[PDB]
Amino acid sequence: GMMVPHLTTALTGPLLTLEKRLLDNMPRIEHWFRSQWQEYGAPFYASVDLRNAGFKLAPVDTNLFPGGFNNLNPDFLPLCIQAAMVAVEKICPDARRLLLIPENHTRNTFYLRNVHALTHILRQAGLEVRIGSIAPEITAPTFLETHDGHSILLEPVRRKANRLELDNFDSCAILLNNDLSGGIPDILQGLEQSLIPPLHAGWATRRKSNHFTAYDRVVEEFAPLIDIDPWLLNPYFDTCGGLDFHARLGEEQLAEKVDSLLAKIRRKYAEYGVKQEPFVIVKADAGTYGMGIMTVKSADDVRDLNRKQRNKMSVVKEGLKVSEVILQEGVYTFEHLKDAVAEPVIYMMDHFVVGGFYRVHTSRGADENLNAPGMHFEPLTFETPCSTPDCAGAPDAAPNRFYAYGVVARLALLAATIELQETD
């Protein structure tokens, strides 16, 4: 009776091939993941955005600071609690107390609901948890309403002798729910307490293309394990160095790389009988200053950019802050909830899939199967577990689709784990 998203494409052969390979190799796959986690560990928590194109199933974002805990299905709270307990035992085994640092947002009601939901899980895992703000406008204990009969209490972090403290509260470890993409503040540097994840100065200006290389390496091992075309799991990408988007010196360089990537995508689209237009996501990385993103369908789309596009791709008015441009094969999503495009987000704690939700696009044009939704979505909670495949059933039965989602999400998790280890 509960309506769920369905694919609006009949071209699903590659997805079903992937599902068949996973369901014919299920114990081999799970044994392989266990070998990987013995070598690498896993983060405390994470979320991975996927897109199901019917001809491809690929991760498109990995977040080590997930902010949608309030969107999880409450029937799965016990599974989350148990996984959070495992994470505590691996990452901070002796912890009694945990300081949670949120994003600096105090006016997003949904973000505050996430904080409440996350805090609840961590308390049920047996930790004493308090919320320590690093927002400069929080100067005293501040109660913020979630507009649902509850509130959260934000307290300003105080640094004393290489430790962060709150009123009568000295934690063992510090959990970041703030991605620090603007740079690790000096107040969080050189502390005695461990940060989770353990970020160090340099984090925010790291070479972000290493994320895509790390996922390539994971897929290069996994794809032959199950005998699948690695392209079914992995978008192509390329990079170039920093460019000045207020000049045209870098124009031909960029255009040539767009053309070459589009050509690679076209070869695969021909192989698999795909009729949609190839597209490329152009990501201008300006480190602490942010990132500018645009999508293109031809090399001409990066030539002679207009004023607004130049400003977007430069990221800020300060000159030449872009240090790398990443070009990635765009992946379609053909999942729809009635007229709305939907795309899934898979949640993990330690190396276990705990659930997730769909982002159901609020916009409604012909190109919502291409456009990234950003903040323009409403969540729709998952109805099916990801850890209960039916190996003899239909390959695209719901539990088998969700098993496949959980496999690709765990590949992306492993890649992020490897990447983070290699920043030291």
Q: Which residues bind a second copy (CB under 8 A)?
A: 26-31, 33-35, 37-38, 75-79, 81-83, 85-86, 88-89, 93-96, 123-128, 352, 385, 387-389
CB of 356 to a second copy, least distance (A): 13
Q: Give the one entry of a second copy, Cl ion, none that residue 389 binds, where binding means its C-beta sits below a cut-off of 5 to 8 angstroms depending on kind.
A: a second copy
Question: Which positions ≥6 away from 270 have C-beta within 8 Å?
Answer: none
- Angle 231-235-240 (CA atoms, 0-180°, nearest 5)? 130
3-state SS string for 86-139: HHHHHHCCCCCEEEEEECCCCCCHHHHHHHHHHHHHHHHCCCEEEEEECCCCCC
For every residue of 318-370, DSSP letters joined together read SSS---EEEEEE-----EEETTEEEEEEEEEETTEEEEEEEEEES--STTTTT
The secondary structure element, H or E, covering residue 292 is strand 291-296
Looking at the chain, how many residues does it have? 424
**Does the footprint of Cl ion cover residue 183 (CB under 5 A)?**
yes
Task: Confirm or reject binding of residue 94 to Cl ion (CB under 5 A).
Answer: yes
Q: How far is the CB of 168 from Cl ion (least distance, A)?
A: 21
* Identity of the residue, 22 or 92, whose beta carbon is nearer to Cl ion in the bound complex: 92
Q: Which is nearer to Cl ion, 58 or 175 (CB)?
A: 175
In the list 203, 255, 256, 396, the residue contacting Cl ion (rule: CB under 5 A) is 203
Residue 125, contacted partner among Cl ion, a second copy, none, CB below 5-8 A by kind: a second copy
Written as one letter, the residue type at 410 is R
Q: Which does 266 bind (CB under 5 to 8 A by kind): a second copy, Cl ion, none?
A: none
How many beta carbons lie within 10 A of that of residue 387, not counting itself?
Answer: 13
From the list Cl ion, a second copy, none, pick the one residue 83 interacts with, judged by a Cβ distance below 5 to 8 Å according to partner type.
a second copy
Helix, strand or coil for residue 38?
helix
Size of the site for Cl ion (CB under 5 A): 9
CB 296 within 8 A of CB 282: yes
Among a second copy, Cl ion, none, what binds residue 89 when CB lies within 5 to 8 Å by partner kind?
a second copy
282 in Cβ contact with 310 (< 8 Å): no
Contact 64, 45 (CB under 8 A): yes
Task: Tell me which stretch binds Cl ion (CB under 5 A): 183-191, 266-274, 336-344, 370-378.
Answer: 183-191
> Which residue lies nearer to a second copy by CB, 26 or 294?
26
203 binds, among Cl ion, a second copy, none (CB under 5 to 8 A by kind): Cl ion
Q: How many angstroms separate the CA atoms of 411 and 39, rounded?
A: 14
Q: Of 128 and 256, which has the nearer Cβ to a second copy?
A: 128
Q: How far is the CB of 381 from a second copy (least distance, A)?
A: 15
Give which of a second copy, Cl ion, none residue 388 binds (C-beta under 5 to 8 Å, depending on kind): a second copy
Among 377, 343, 292, 355, which residue's Cα sits nearest to residue 56?
343
92 near Cl ion, rule: CB under 5 A? yes
**In angstroms, rounded to a whole number, what is the distance separating the alpha carbons of residues 392 and 50?**
25
Closest to Cl ion by CB, 84 vs 299, is 84
Which residue number, 95 or 286, has a Cβ lying nearer to a second copy? Answer: 95
Under rule CB under 5 A, residue 204 binds Cl ion: yes
The nearest distance, CB 38 to Cl ion, in angstroms, is 10
Smallest separation, CB 298 to a second copy (Å): 45
Tokens linked to 298: 């031809």
Instruction: Pick the piece of the chain touching Cl ion (CB under 5 A) from 76-84, 88-96, 235-243, 383-391.
Output: 88-96
User: Which partner in a second copy, Cl ion, none is near 92 (CB below 5 to 8 A by kind)?
Assistant: Cl ion
User: Distance (Å, rounded) from C-alpha 391 to C-alpha 19?
Assistant: 9
Nearer to a second copy, 132 or 389 (CB): 389
| Nearest to a second copy of 126, 393 (CB atom) | 126
> Is the CB of 305 or the CB of 349 nearer to a second copy?
349
Task: Output the six-digit token pair for 100.
Answer: 């949670």
Residues β-bridged to residue 283: 293, 326
Residue 93 touches Cl ion, criterion: CB under 5 A? yes
CB of 77 to a second copy, least distance (A): 6
Closer Cβ to a second copy, 124 or 362, answer by number? 124
292 forms bridges with which residues in the sheet?
Answer: 284
Write the CA distances from 88 to 5, 74, 170, 198, integer angstroms. 34, 21, 17, 14
Q: Which of a second copy, Cl ion, none does 191 bind, CB closer than 5 to 8 A by kind?
A: none
Q: Give the footprint of Cl ion on this chain (CB under 5 A).
A: 92-95, 183-184, 201, 203-204
